[PDB]
Amino acid sequence: PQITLWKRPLVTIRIGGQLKEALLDTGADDTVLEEMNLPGKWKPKMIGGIGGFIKVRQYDQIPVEICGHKAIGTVLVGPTPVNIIGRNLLTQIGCTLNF
Amino acid sequence: PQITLWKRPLVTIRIGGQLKEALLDTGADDTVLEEMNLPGKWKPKMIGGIGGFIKVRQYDQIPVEICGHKAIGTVLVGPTPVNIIGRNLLTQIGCTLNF
């Protein structure tokens, strides 16, 4: 769909059978979700944001449904203030910035 | 334009007479620019996200041209690695997310 930026671009995603709300974020390289239990072996990874670097659990090849569009990719889980869908999954659902 | 997200959406901006590269960030509510010595009255602010919080100076009514599109609004200046164009200015250049 076309999403305007007057409000935060929050979307319902479905991941691990759970629905959640997440921010469509073109400023994020990765998709990083609040601490949740996900299936799979995960590796620790460190990522940075505006405030510094945090350690996250990296899960690969996870299926995520973002507004009904399917993506299968890496999901990072850790202490983020908000679930963010980053560019690794936004490209899979064909999302672009336009103006 | 239509910007795909295979790479970070970096764009040229002009603020206070200087040309800068800045990230179009739909996740950011407000624009936050790297340390720069702008004229004006400013107010102390703390903004946070992954990794914690950084202290920034808030300037208001600052004109910015983002890809030759004029906008004007609040700019936070603080120790960020990347200039971030947030929703407060992206809404003014009519920027939209589409998929």
Partner: peptide
């Protein structure tokens, strides 16, 4: 791996 930067996430703003």
């Amino acid at each position: 791996s930067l996430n703003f």
